[PDB]
């Protein structure tokens, strides 16, 4: 029994949901970083983006 695992190069992944904008699948951090995306996102997509955020927002408070 040995260990070939070292952990010398790992991208700290972040739980990021997918929010579609204009029918195009973008990530949450992607949609939030692009004001044009939310500006070209439909009410449904905006509400979806907002709702998806509330899910993560409800997982804070600490």
Task: Name, in order, each residue with C-beta under 8 angstroms of 48's C-beta and a sequence gap of 6 or more.
Answer: 19, 20
Residue 59 interacts with another protein (CB under 8 A)? yes
Do 17 and 28 form a contact (C-beta atoms < 8 A)?
A: yes
Contact map string, positions 27 to 46, toward another protein, x by CB under 8 A: xx------------------
Residue 56 interacts with another protein (CB under 8 A): yes or no: yes
Which H helix or E strand runs over 21?
strand 18-21
Q: Which residue has the tokens 């709702």?
A: 51
- Residue 17 near another protein by CB under 8 A: yes
What does the binding site for another protein look like in residue numbers (CB under 8 A)?
2-5, 7, 9-18, 27-28, 52, 55-56, 59-60, 62
């Amino acid at each position: 029994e040995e260990d070939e695992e070292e952990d010398d190069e790992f991208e700290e992944v972040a739980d990021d949901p997918i929010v579609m904008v204009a029918g195009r699948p973008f990530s949450y951090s992607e949609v939030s970083q692009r004001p044009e995306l939310v500006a070209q996102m439909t009410p449904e997509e905006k509400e979806a983006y907002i709702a998806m955020g509330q899910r993560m927002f409800e997982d804070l408070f600490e």
